[PDB]
Amino acid sequence: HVLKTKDVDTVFVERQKKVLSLFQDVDQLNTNDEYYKIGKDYDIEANIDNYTNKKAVEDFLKMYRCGFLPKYNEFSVFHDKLRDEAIALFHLFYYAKDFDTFYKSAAFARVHLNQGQFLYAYYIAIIQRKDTYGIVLPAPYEIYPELFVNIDTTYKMFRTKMQNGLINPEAAVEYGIVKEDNHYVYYSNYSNAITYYNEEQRLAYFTEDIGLNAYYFFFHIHLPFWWTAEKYGNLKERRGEMYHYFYDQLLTRYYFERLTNGLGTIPEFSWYSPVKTGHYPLLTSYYTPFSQRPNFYNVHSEENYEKIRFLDAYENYFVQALQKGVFEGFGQTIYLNDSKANSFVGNYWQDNADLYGEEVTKDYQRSYEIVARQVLGAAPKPFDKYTFMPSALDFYQTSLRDPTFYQLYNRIIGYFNQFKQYLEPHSQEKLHFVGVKVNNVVVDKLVTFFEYYDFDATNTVFLTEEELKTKYPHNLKVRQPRLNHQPFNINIDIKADVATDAVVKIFMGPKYNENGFPITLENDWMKFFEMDWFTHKITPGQNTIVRNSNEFVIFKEDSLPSTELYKLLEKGKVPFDMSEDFGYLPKRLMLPRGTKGGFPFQFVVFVYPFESTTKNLTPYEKFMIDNKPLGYPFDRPVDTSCFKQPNIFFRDVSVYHEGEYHAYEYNVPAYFSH
Template structure:
């Protein structure tokens, strides 16, 4: 019998050994004091087993005992507490219901809950309030609001929140993989290790590993499925969720650090996101981002194999007709909103809501961004407004094809209903591409940069050298244990964990070397952009038609000396990117050492570094690298994280009317190629189940 057990173990080990393992990166940490560690541990406990209660946890006992109404003096804004209590007494979203911030009533409740969190007078009151809310309110409504409160409160700056794909794994993982985890849990392990391995399930170090693929043509059709590794990437979708958590559309700028540049930040984020998406489309042989009309059928289908823990996601078929007779008022609103903006531009100014905006001024970008986000700052000088009349919210609802629900608290899930899943739906990029076209129309009213404005006297870039740019797929691992129901004993012991292992796009580190000759000794600012070299049909594309498609890779300050300067910039130091988040289990280990991952504490809202470069092709896909250097002004910055106060995306924040202005000595364009190496399709790295078996019978 002992021999049989040993042989079975050897078979299991050999099967696991044949499956690939994830790569790991070196984690940069920073030291924190004992008070920070104590607060960090308290915060992390709220994110464990979101769907379940551990009655032994400190927060549960605190939440049950805390007398919220009797503690109103512990909040700096008593009116906010009173407004919350009015809503709470009338009936908040019950537990175990689907939560979406795009629902009118849920939005009102969430704003009230956030205000209570935000105005807690100290961290201890904040913690007790969060514990009370965790016990009494809807679990996902609580987590959503708690996330944002952590980012916004002054006394929680630097506190780490787990990656959203650990907190809400069902929003980042297809149902096929989640159901595998459910089955393993229900049958208490692997009944047949060989069969399980064939389906990409193995056990390693007391953890269950599920090898996961991306969605196929069943979800996207034959073309868009090529981009699934990008649109479904857990890091990219987490990045979008972080951005919303930092700049919620419903929050006034009294809580924000970029009070005067909020609309500009919104524009820059979406411009960069769509430019990056466009580079990926080019690598995969796809054309321009398609366009759509509210009056015509929506041709882009989307059939997600996704599910909340209660309801499956709604599907949208091809040639989807928005029911005009049902949504007449909504369609009229969207059409009027678009035309009203164009009329503002034609007049050259906007005057309403105690505001007067001159569209010829570069500062008007803040108004334009606020207009299209429909945030409170657009109407900040007048009475409170109804957020439901938002272009974004109504557009998302119509495009998601979600039928009306007649139950009081029921929200039927769709990809566009959640920030965690929006990037998965191809129509998302078409919607925001439509919005950005109005930004481009507005940009034409701005005075283009002159030769003198862009010139840097006495500074010349002689040459730019870039290492070979290489991308590949490697495996990444993330924890989905939060999405699996566990017994009380399992919650306490936390022994077995459920992990997804999935191929993700990555690149080899590279260095950009810039040779600069300077006749002056001064502080200079450098920017590095990556943009298309050819359009989707293979023709060279001019800068006049291409300026909006450049992705800003880096932004840094450097002191130039008189004479020759050799500047080497590693991709690992690029300004806008961060490494993958660390699992919660690892965060606890760092806390025991008095440390936390630096990226997660300081740069949580940066883009995933592994997606810095588009996939490219095996033979090398052509792009162009644009390097720009300009004088550092040294003026007061809007935020300490910024290099200076130039417009976001400068100098590609305005149309290029004369391309010769961008061929000055302090600018340099370099043709580069992105080479892809290794297995071309992610699914080929995964389960043998997905690869057609070869005929082993010899032919006669």
């Protein structure tokens, strides 16, 4: 298994090394590094001519002269002041006329501003600026290790750095601390191996997977809710569509993990009753432990009355719009069948900039999601604008760790899916592919297993004045057994009459509902996980297609550590996926953990005529190369019919799991010491 690579020129390489020079030892400043001198004395005012937008720069300066979030404090985009500052900073980065002015602005920020705040605006700018297109971003877990690993292993790294090494390596092994080469390796367990407060803990290997969490972070920085989608041209008109697709797909995938663990559907809650599923983040900031929400949390308390009424009102509005058939307000009146209605509900639920026709949201345009994250996070109200007790719900990099995150968005998609039943359902004729028929589909054995995975966590530690004189160590390694599966083929048999360009899609869906009974397309159309999308020229007669799971376009390879990125740069290359598909879900997670006896699911292949791609979303996500609605044909209900189309095939499938069932078993000292 070789990783696909891509060729880059000398300019790109030079810009790549520059951006990476600002992603090192992020919680500390190195006066020996070139960036410190540049950044410390950069005069934004004096170079105001090197920015395409003078107003944005002046607003930044005006804001900056008043002070920004101090260093070391936690930064969260869900807090007004912090967000506005971060956004002003983003504008300073985005409007730099050229890479050089941008780099200097970045260095300025790195030296003067809050590390978290800088990293946030930095990450987004690299994604948004045209001149940095293709630039490979370092893994978020490598940049925010304190957000991707529990305190028990963070504390072990702290103890190692404080002791300046291992004092008794033979004893350290019993605490998962091993030395390999010149690296210190830390075997890190998911939380279900240290605390089991509720049954949802059984899903910890999935909800705490660094790749899954990185995936949500990438989703957000690819296109922040506070920013307009203008830059992406077409996506703007299809933004709400993308919202639905992303969350439906994520919720459905999470649902599958629940199913193979016997946890049933995503729980429903009320803002007027205790929230059943609590959550205890084993994370910490530099000033406080993350807030905890005990099981059966009394959410309807005096501190949340007003917020709950707002959330209620927000839901009420939508439900009433569905009833009367029209969305009023926001400067327009949309009937449910309007051609922009789909984008409206999506933008409405997310309360994004595009809902208002602006480039950035304002503080007074209150958000359902932000307020809901606030009350579900269970944190006491902020001490002040710059100080708050964070919860898993305050970061896109830790959101998926909280069971209520899925419950919140499942509630939202719940309404979105209700809205979809008011639309014209897909007719049997529009779904039919005259001349095309799928005679059979055979799927190879589906097997999951846990496999060790390492990543650089050195950013967890603080370097010595002497250590800063020499090259960075990239000394610490965090090792966790992560979910994965064996590659598998899908053999498709297609009997055709005429020759035509066809599109073939591969989905994965449940076979039974939570109670073990047969699924129903009428109520379960939204439970199909899109796995593949590709064009294929169908020749008259017999057509045999073989798609290997490693080829599914929906997923990407694991990221490589910054150190391997450099070696690859010497060759004038960059990982293909890491550069162009950084937002895709890691392929090692395309399958939910199976069971020893094999858990029931079904694959489905659908092939339809290839045609218009005039309003595709390639500038956003590469695989979106058609005009059909995202998730087609499971994007909305379908005109109930008891006789399936010949161009769609459903194949039963079983997901088995090999090796140790529980991930923590691979971190038992007796085991890894062999």
